[PDB]
Amino acid sequence: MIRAVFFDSLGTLISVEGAAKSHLKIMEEVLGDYPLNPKTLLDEYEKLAREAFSNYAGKPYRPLRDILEEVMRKLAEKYGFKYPENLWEISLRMSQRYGELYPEVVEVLKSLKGKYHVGMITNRDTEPATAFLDALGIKDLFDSITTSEEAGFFKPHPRIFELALKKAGVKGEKAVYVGDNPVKDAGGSKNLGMTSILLDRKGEKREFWDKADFIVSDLREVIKIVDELNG
Ligand SMILES: [Ca+2]
């Protein structure tokens, strides 16, 4: 029996497009009148951020604030602009201003309540992740929010999934994990017996579909999978 449904954050519940807009707005704020195209700065930021995602995946937790201050110090040195004071506060403000949910999220979370434990599993730090969910009005639609900061390790290390399952009070075989990252994200979930659902919104990850138990393009399909597993 499936008793718990856990969701990834960025790309699953939280819009990639809203995150990109919030990051562009951060770059615009950092640069001010400095004569660098903010879109160019953004692309270089995202490259370094991806190379940090890769380096820390599955590793012991390190605060995201520290990782992103390191990235931005490299960029300021490279391009000659002043390193921005209070960067974390700028980033929190912009993220809450321009962040968005995918359009089906509220419907989906509400459909599961009272039937399954509903959880989010994220690599983000606890306070910002929880504050963001509160700003978007859905914090109370979750039974659990489990973070790398709580577990001590980033996805796909099993410990973060182990903690989410302990909060729900069930073995992995009784849970689904839904996320958009085939690589460097769901591996620990399969270690523990969870059923993996790969969310591929644009049909762009076909070469990795064999890594997952089920593939969906819309979160409204998740409850149909869970019902079928339970029927
Ligand atoms: Ca993701």
PDB file of C-alpha atoms and ligand atoms in Angstrom:
ATOM      1  CA  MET A   1       0.000   0.000   0.000  1.00  0.00           C
ATOM      2  CA  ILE A   2       1.203   3.494  -0.865  1.00  0.00           C
ATOM      3  CA  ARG A   3       0.758   5.749   2.153  1.00  0.00           C
ATOM      4  CA  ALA A   4       3.066   8.682   1.425  1.00  0.00           C
ATOM      5  CA  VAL A   5       3.841  10.886  -1.561  1.00  0.00           C
ATOM      6  CA  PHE A   6       6.997  13.000  -1.512  1.00  0.00           C
ATOM      7  CA  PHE A   7       7.839  15.777  -3.952  1.00  0.00           C
ATOM      8  CA  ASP A   8      11.021  17.460  -5.104  1.00  0.00           C
ATOM      9  CA  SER A   9      11.021  21.275  -5.056  1.00  0.00           C
ATOM     10  CA  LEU A  10      12.560  23.104  -8.023  1.00  0.00           C
ATOM     11  CA  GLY A  11      11.244  21.849 -11.344  1.00  0.00           C
ATOM     12  CA  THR A  12       8.551  19.759  -9.636  1.00  0.00           C
ATOM     13  CA  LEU A  13       6.465  22.076  -7.423  1.00  0.00           C
ATOM     14  CA  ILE A  14       8.394  25.312  -7.978  1.00  0.00           C
ATOM     15  CA  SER A  15       8.658  26.796 -11.452  1.00  0.00           C
ATOM     16  CA  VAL A  16      12.006  26.822 -13.247  1.00  0.00           C
ATOM     17  CA  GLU A  17      10.802  29.874 -15.162  1.00  0.00           C
ATOM     18  CA  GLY A  18      10.039  31.789 -11.973  1.00  0.00           C
ATOM     19  CA  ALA A  19      13.432  30.866 -10.564  1.00  0.00           C
ATOM     20  CA  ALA A  20      15.134  32.083 -13.739  1.00  0.00           C
ATOM     21  CA  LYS A  21      13.252  35.379 -13.511  1.00  0.00           C
ATOM     22  CA  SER A  22      14.192  35.802  -9.855  1.00  0.00           C
ATOM     23  CA  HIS A  23      17.834  35.078 -10.670  1.00  0.00           C
ATOM     24  CA  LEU A  24      17.875  37.577 -13.518  1.00  0.00           C
ATOM     25  CA  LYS A  25      16.404  40.176 -11.149  1.00  0.00           C
ATOM     26  CA  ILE A  26      19.119  39.381  -8.596  1.00  0.00           C
ATOM     27  CA  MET A  27      21.792  39.963 -11.258  1.00  0.00           C
ATOM     28  CA  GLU A  28      20.153  43.241 -12.298  1.00  0.00           C
ATOM     29  CA  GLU A  29      20.110  44.383  -8.660  1.00  0.00           C
ATOM     30  CA  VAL A  30      23.741  43.362  -8.058  1.00  0.00           C
ATOM     31  CA  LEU A  31      25.023  45.119 -11.170  1.00  0.00           C
ATOM     32  CA  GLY A  32      23.222  48.439 -10.888  1.00  0.00           C
ATOM     33  CA  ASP A  33      24.628  50.690 -13.628  1.00  0.00           C
ATOM     34  CA  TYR A  34      27.690  48.488 -14.214  1.00  0.00           C
ATOM     35  CA  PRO A  35      28.034  47.976 -17.999  1.00  0.00           C
ATOM     36  CA  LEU A  36      27.718  44.184 -18.058  1.00  0.00           C
ATOM     37  CA  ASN A  37      24.667  42.545 -19.601  1.00  0.00           C
ATOM     38  CA  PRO A  38      22.752  40.963 -16.668  1.00  0.00           C
ATOM     39  CA  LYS A  39      21.712  38.089 -18.909  1.00  0.00           C
ATOM     40  CA  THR A  40      25.386  37.329 -19.529  1.00  0.00           C
ATOM     41  CA  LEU A  41      26.140  37.464 -15.817  1.00  0.00           C
ATOM     42  CA  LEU A  42      23.142  35.193 -15.197  1.00  0.00           C
ATOM     43  CA  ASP A  43      24.308  32.585 -17.664  1.00  0.00           C
ATOM     44  CA  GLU A  44      27.780  32.519 -16.082  1.00  0.00           C
ATOM     45  CA  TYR A  45      26.216  32.325 -12.614  1.00  0.00           C
ATOM     46  CA  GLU A  46      24.059  29.379 -13.646  1.00  0.00           C
ATOM     47  CA  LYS A  47      27.074  27.537 -15.097  1.00  0.00           C
ATOM     48  CA  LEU A  48      28.964  27.888 -11.823  1.00  0.00           C
ATOM     49  CA  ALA A  49      25.842  26.981  -9.869  1.00  0.00           C
ATOM     50  CA  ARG A  50      25.384  23.805 -11.934  1.00  0.00           C
ATOM     51  CA  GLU A  51      29.036  22.898 -11.334  1.00  0.00           C
ATOM     52  CA  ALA A  52      28.415  23.380  -7.600  1.00  0.00           C
ATOM     53  CA  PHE A  53      25.220  21.259  -7.739  1.00  0.00           C
ATOM     54  CA  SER A  54      27.324  18.502  -9.272  1.00  0.00           C
ATOM     55  CA  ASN A  55      30.122  18.794  -6.733  1.00  0.00           C
ATOM     56  CA  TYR A  56      27.881  18.653  -3.660  1.00  0.00           C
ATOM     57  CA  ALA A  57      25.321  16.080  -4.797  1.00  0.00           C
ATOM     58  CA  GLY A  58      25.235  13.243  -2.304  1.00  0.00           C
ATOM     59  CA  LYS A  59      27.782  14.954  -0.037  1.00  0.00           C
ATOM     60  CA  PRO A  60      27.622  16.289   3.511  1.00  0.00           C
ATOM     61  CA  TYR A  61      25.541  19.416   3.914  1.00  0.00           C
ATOM     62  CA  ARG A  62      27.169  22.843   3.487  1.00  0.00           C
ATOM     63  CA  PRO A  63      24.984  25.984   3.727  1.00  0.00           C
ATOM     64  CA  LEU A  64      23.693  27.135   0.357  1.00  0.00           C
ATOM     65  CA  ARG A  65      24.412  30.741   1.346  1.00  0.00           C
ATOM     66  CA  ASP A  66      28.098  29.907   1.565  1.00  0.00           C
ATOM     67  CA  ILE A  67      28.115  28.168  -1.796  1.00  0.00           C
ATOM     68  CA  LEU A  68      26.398  31.049  -3.498  1.00  0.00           C
ATOM     69  CA  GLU A  69      28.636  33.712  -1.875  1.00  0.00           C
ATOM     70  CA  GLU A  70      31.631  31.788  -3.260  1.00  0.00           C
ATOM     71  CA  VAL A  71      30.132  31.775  -6.755  1.00  0.00           C
ATOM     72  CA  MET A  72      29.349  35.485  -6.667  1.00  0.00           C
ATOM     73  CA  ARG A  73      32.781  36.433  -5.319  1.00  0.00           C
ATOM     74  CA  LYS A  74      34.304  34.644  -8.325  1.00  0.00           C
ATOM     75  CA  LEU A  75      32.026  36.560 -10.702  1.00  0.00           C
ATOM     76  CA  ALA A  76      32.668  39.958  -9.113  1.00  0.00           C
ATOM     77  CA  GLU A  77      36.431  39.385  -9.312  1.00  0.00           C
ATOM     78  CA  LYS A  78      36.188  38.207 -12.917  1.00  0.00           C
ATOM     79  CA  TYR A  79      34.102  41.114 -14.215  1.00  0.00           C
ATOM     80  CA  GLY A  80      35.266  43.949 -11.968  1.00  0.00           C
ATOM     81  CA  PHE A  81      32.022  44.916 -10.225  1.00  0.00           C
ATOM     82  CA  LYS A  82      31.828  45.371  -6.477  1.00  0.00           C
ATOM     83  CA  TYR A  83      30.885  42.288  -4.525  1.00  0.00           C
ATOM     84  CA  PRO A  84      27.327  42.942  -3.298  1.00  0.00           C
ATOM     85  CA  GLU A  85      26.817  43.329   0.431  1.00  0.00           C
ATOM     86  CA  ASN A  86      23.815  41.516   1.897  1.00  0.00           C
ATOM     87  CA  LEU A  87      23.542  39.276  -1.170  1.00  0.00           C
ATOM     88  CA  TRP A  88      21.570  36.651   0.753  1.00  0.00           C
ATOM     89  CA  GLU A  89      18.874  39.202   1.652  1.00  0.00           C
ATOM     90  CA  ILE A  90      18.642  40.379  -1.974  1.00  0.00           C
ATOM     91  CA  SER A  91      18.262  36.759  -3.057  1.00  0.00           C
ATOM     92  CA  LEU A  92      15.579  35.943  -0.487  1.00  0.00           C
ATOM     93  CA  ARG A  93      13.592  39.050  -1.469  1.00  0.00           C
ATOM     94  CA  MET A  94      13.761  38.349  -5.195  1.00  0.00           C
ATOM     95  CA  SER A  95      12.986  34.644  -4.749  1.00  0.00           C
ATOM     96  CA  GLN A  96       9.820  35.401  -2.798  1.00  0.00           C
ATOM     97  CA  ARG A  97       8.825  38.201  -5.221  1.00  0.00           C
ATOM     98  CA  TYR A  98       9.137  36.242  -8.487  1.00  0.00           C
ATOM     99  CA  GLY A  99       8.901  32.622  -7.416  1.00  0.00           C
ATOM    100  CA  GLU A 100       5.890  30.709  -8.647  1.00  0.00           C
ATOM    101  CA  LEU A 101       4.269  27.301  -8.399  1.00  0.00           C
ATOM    102  CA  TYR A 102       3.457  25.174 -11.419  1.00  0.00           C
ATOM    103  CA  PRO A 103      -0.257  25.667 -12.138  1.00  0.00           C
ATOM    104  CA  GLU A 104      -1.508  22.236 -11.006  1.00  0.00           C
ATOM    105  CA  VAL A 105       0.367  22.165  -7.678  1.00  0.00           C
ATOM    106  CA  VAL A 106      -2.297  23.473  -5.282  1.00  0.00           C
ATOM    107  CA  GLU A 107      -4.938  21.154  -6.791  1.00  0.00           C
ATOM    108  CA  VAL A 108      -2.612  18.143  -6.516  1.00  0.00           C
ATOM    109  CA  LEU A 109      -1.505  18.768  -2.940  1.00  0.00           C
ATOM    110  CA  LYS A 110      -5.090  19.277  -1.825  1.00  0.00           C
ATOM    111  CA  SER A 111      -6.224  16.078  -3.567  1.00  0.00           C
ATOM    112  CA  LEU A 112      -3.811  13.999  -1.523  1.00  0.00           C
ATOM    113  CA  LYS A 113      -4.598  15.480   1.890  1.00  0.00           C
ATOM    114  CA  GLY A 114      -6.388  13.133   4.260  1.00  0.00           C
ATOM    115  CA  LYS A 115      -5.459  10.157   2.089  1.00  0.00           C
ATOM    116  CA  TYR A 116      -1.647  10.166   1.987  1.00  0.00           C
ATOM    117  CA  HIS A 117       1.183  11.780   3.882  1.00  0.00           C
ATOM    118  CA  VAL A 118       2.287  14.699   1.678  1.00  0.00           C
ATOM    119  CA  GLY A 119       5.952  15.656   1.928  1.00  0.00           C
ATOM    120  CA  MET A 120       8.545  17.865   0.268  1.00  0.00           C
ATOM    121  CA  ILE A 121      12.209  16.789   0.098  1.00  0.00           C
ATOM    122  CA  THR A 122      14.651  19.563  -0.808  1.00  0.00           C
ATOM    123  CA  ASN A 123      18.346  20.379  -0.875  1.00  0.00           C
ATOM    124  CA  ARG A 124      17.599  23.951   0.227  1.00  0.00           C
ATOM    125  CA  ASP A 125      18.204  25.199   3.745  1.00  0.00           C
ATOM    126  CA  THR A 126      15.266  24.803   6.091  1.00  0.00           C
ATOM    127  CA  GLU A 127      14.438  28.424   6.926  1.00  0.00           C
ATOM    128  CA  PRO A 128      14.458  29.773   3.331  1.00  0.00           C
ATOM    129  CA  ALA A 129      12.658  26.727   1.976  1.00  0.00           C
ATOM    130  CA  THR A 130       9.923  26.961   4.586  1.00  0.00           C
ATOM    131  CA  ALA A 131       9.629  30.759   4.247  1.00  0.00           C
ATOM    132  CA  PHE A 132       9.244  30.396   0.496  1.00  0.00           C
ATOM    133  CA  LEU A 133       6.441  27.851   0.872  1.00  0.00           C
ATOM    134  CA  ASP A 134       4.799  30.210   3.371  1.00  0.00           C
ATOM    135  CA  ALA A 135       5.110  33.159   0.966  1.00  0.00           C
ATOM    136  CA  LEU A 136       3.468  31.087  -1.801  1.00  0.00           C
ATOM    137  CA  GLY A 137       0.694  30.070   0.602  1.00  0.00           C
ATOM    138  CA  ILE A 138       1.137  26.281   0.658  1.00  0.00           C
ATOM    139  CA  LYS A 139       3.255  25.534   3.738  1.00  0.00           C
ATOM    140  CA  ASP A 140       0.266  24.041   5.546  1.00  0.00           C
ATOM    141  CA  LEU A 141      -0.538  21.694   2.628  1.00  0.00           C
ATOM    142  CA  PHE A 142       2.447  19.547   3.658  1.00  0.00           C
ATOM    143  CA  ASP A 143       2.644  16.955   6.418  1.00  0.00           C
ATOM    144  CA  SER A 144       6.448  17.183   6.260  1.00  0.00           C
ATOM    145  CA  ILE A 145       9.232  19.302   4.811  1.00  0.00           C
ATOM    146  CA  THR A 146      12.606  17.535   4.889  1.00  0.00           C
ATOM    147  CA  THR A 147      15.825  19.300   4.010  1.00  0.00           C
ATOM    148  CA  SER A 148      19.494  18.565   3.511  1.00  0.00           C
ATOM    149  CA  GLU A 149      20.176  20.783   6.541  1.00  0.00           C
ATOM    150  CA  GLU A 150      18.061  18.495   8.728  1.00  0.00           C
ATOM    151  CA  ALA A 151      19.463  15.213   7.372  1.00  0.00           C
ATOM    152  CA  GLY A 152      23.083  16.358   7.148  1.00  0.00           C
ATOM    153  CA  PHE A 153      23.456  15.305   3.489  1.00  0.00           C
ATOM    154  CA  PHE A 154      22.319  16.438   0.056  1.00  0.00           C
ATOM    155  CA  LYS A 155      20.241  14.326  -2.310  1.00  0.00           C
ATOM    156  CA  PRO A 156      20.705  11.654  -3.559  1.00  0.00           C
ATOM    157  CA  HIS A 157      22.261  10.490  -0.289  1.00  0.00           C
ATOM    158  CA  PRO A 158      19.849   8.047   1.381  1.00  0.00           C
ATOM    159  CA  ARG A 159      19.810   9.841   4.740  1.00  0.00           C
ATOM    160  CA  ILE A 160      17.505  12.640   3.544  1.00  0.00           C
ATOM    161  CA  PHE A 161      15.018  10.072   2.217  1.00  0.00           C
ATOM    162  CA  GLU A 162      15.377   7.993   5.384  1.00  0.00           C
ATOM    163  CA  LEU A 163      14.411  11.045   7.456  1.00  0.00           C
ATOM    164  CA  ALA A 164      11.393  11.887   5.293  1.00  0.00           C
ATOM    165  CA  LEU A 165      10.181   8.302   5.637  1.00  0.00           C
ATOM    166  CA  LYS A 166      10.667   8.329   9.419  1.00  0.00           C
ATOM    167  CA  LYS A 167       8.568  11.486   9.673  1.00  0.00           C
ATOM    168  CA  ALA A 168       5.788   9.712   7.736  1.00  0.00           C
ATOM    169  CA  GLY A 169       6.228   6.607   9.890  1.00  0.00           C
ATOM    170  CA  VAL A 170       6.573   4.186   6.984  1.00  0.00           C
ATOM    171  CA  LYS A 171       9.010   2.009   5.074  1.00  0.00           C
ATOM    172  CA  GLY A 172      10.179   3.110   1.638  1.00  0.00           C
ATOM    173  CA  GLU A 173       8.048   0.455  -0.072  1.00  0.00           C
ATOM    174  CA  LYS A 174       5.000   2.438   1.080  1.00  0.00           C
ATOM    175  CA  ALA A 175       6.119   5.704  -0.520  1.00  0.00           C
ATOM    176  CA  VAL A 176       6.468   7.439  -3.888  1.00  0.00           C
ATOM    177  CA  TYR A 177       9.032  10.111  -4.700  1.00  0.00           C
ATOM    178  CA  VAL A 178       8.228  12.510  -7.565  1.00  0.00           C
ATOM    179  CA  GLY A 179      10.994  14.646  -9.061  1.00  0.00           C
ATOM    180  CA  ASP A 180      12.404  16.031 -12.269  1.00  0.00           C
ATOM    181  CA  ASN A 181      16.078  15.042 -11.852  1.00  0.00           C
ATOM    182  CA  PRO A 182      16.885  11.510 -13.062  1.00  0.00           C
ATOM    183  CA  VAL A 183      20.572  11.965 -12.247  1.00  0.00           C
ATOM    184  CA  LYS A 184      21.947  13.150  -8.899  1.00  0.00           C
ATOM    185  CA  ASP A 185      18.560  13.285  -7.187  1.00  0.00           C
ATOM    186  CA  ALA A 186      16.374  10.154  -6.831  1.00  0.00           C
ATOM    187  CA  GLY A 187      19.033   7.441  -6.451  1.00  0.00           C
ATOM    188  CA  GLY A 188      18.826   7.319  -2.673  1.00  0.00           C
ATOM    189  CA  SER A 189      15.042   6.956  -2.959  1.00  0.00           C
ATOM    190  CA  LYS A 190      15.358   3.717  -4.926  1.00  0.00           C
ATOM    191  CA  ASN A 191      17.942   2.373  -2.462  1.00  0.00           C
ATOM    192  CA  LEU A 192      15.220   2.519   0.182  1.00  0.00           C
ATOM    193  CA  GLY A 193      12.469   0.828  -1.779  1.00  0.00           C
ATOM    194  CA  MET A 194      10.550   3.917  -2.817  1.00  0.00           C
ATOM    195  CA  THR A 195       8.663   4.017  -6.090  1.00  0.00           C
ATOM    196  CA  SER A 196      10.223   6.657  -8.330  1.00  0.00           C
ATOM    197  CA  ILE A 197       8.167   8.930 -10.583  1.00  0.00           C
ATOM    198  CA  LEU A 198      10.165  11.019 -13.048  1.00  0.00           C
ATOM    199  CA  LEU A 199       8.448  14.289 -13.960  1.00  0.00           C
ATOM    200  CA  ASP A 200       9.390  15.246 -17.533  1.00  0.00           C
ATOM    201  CA  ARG A 201       7.261  18.323 -18.270  1.00  0.00           C
ATOM    202  CA  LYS A 202       8.633  18.887 -21.781  1.00  0.00           C
ATOM    203  CA  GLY A 203       9.472  15.333 -22.864  1.00  0.00           C
ATOM    204  CA  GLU A 204      13.194  16.162 -22.905  1.00  0.00           C
ATOM    205  CA  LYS A 205      14.692  13.408 -20.726  1.00  0.00           C
ATOM    206  CA  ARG A 206      13.723  10.252 -22.654  1.00  0.00           C
ATOM    207  CA  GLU A 207      17.251   8.810 -22.479  1.00  0.00           C
ATOM    208  CA  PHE A 208      16.887   8.620 -18.683  1.00  0.00           C
ATOM    209  CA  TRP A 209      13.302   7.313 -18.495  1.00  0.00           C
ATOM    210  CA  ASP A 210      14.584   3.804 -17.778  1.00  0.00           C
ATOM    211  CA  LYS A 211      16.004   5.119 -14.464  1.00  0.00           C
ATOM    212  CA  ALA A 212      12.453   5.597 -13.082  1.00  0.00           C
ATOM    213  CA  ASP A 213       9.482   3.354 -12.318  1.00  0.00           C
ATOM    214  CA  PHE A 214       6.938   5.724 -13.892  1.00  0.00           C
ATOM    215  CA  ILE A 215       7.127   8.850 -16.077  1.00  0.00           C
ATOM    216  CA  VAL A 216       4.658  11.749 -16.003  1.00  0.00           C
ATOM    217  CA  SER A 217       4.439  15.146 -17.703  1.00  0.00           C
ATOM    218  CA  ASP A 218       1.927  16.708 -15.250  1.00  0.00           C
ATOM    219  CA  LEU A 219       1.556  16.258 -11.483  1.00  0.00           C
ATOM    220  CA  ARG A 220      -2.178  15.483 -11.872  1.00  0.00           C
ATOM    221  CA  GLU A 221      -1.057  12.041 -13.095  1.00  0.00           C
ATOM    222  CA  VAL A 222       0.515  11.184  -9.722  1.00  0.00           C
ATOM    223  CA  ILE A 223      -2.718  10.439  -7.876  1.00  0.00           C
ATOM    224  CA  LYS A 224      -3.770   8.137 -10.720  1.00  0.00           C
ATOM    225  CA  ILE A 225      -0.533   6.160 -10.339  1.00  0.00           C
ATOM    226  CA  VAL A 226      -0.921   5.929  -6.557  1.00  0.00           C
ATOM    227  CA  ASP A 227      -4.541   4.816  -6.888  1.00  0.00           C
ATOM    228  CA  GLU A 228      -3.518   2.132  -9.372  1.00  0.00           C
ATOM    229  CA  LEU A 229      -0.751   0.875  -7.087  1.00  0.00           C
ATOM    230  CA  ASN A 230      -3.336   0.648  -4.300  1.00  0.00           C
ATOM    231  CA  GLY A 231      -6.028  -0.919  -6.471  1.00  0.00           C
TER     232      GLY A 231
HETATM  233 CA    CA B   1      14.435  19.453  -9.280  1.00  0.00          CA
END
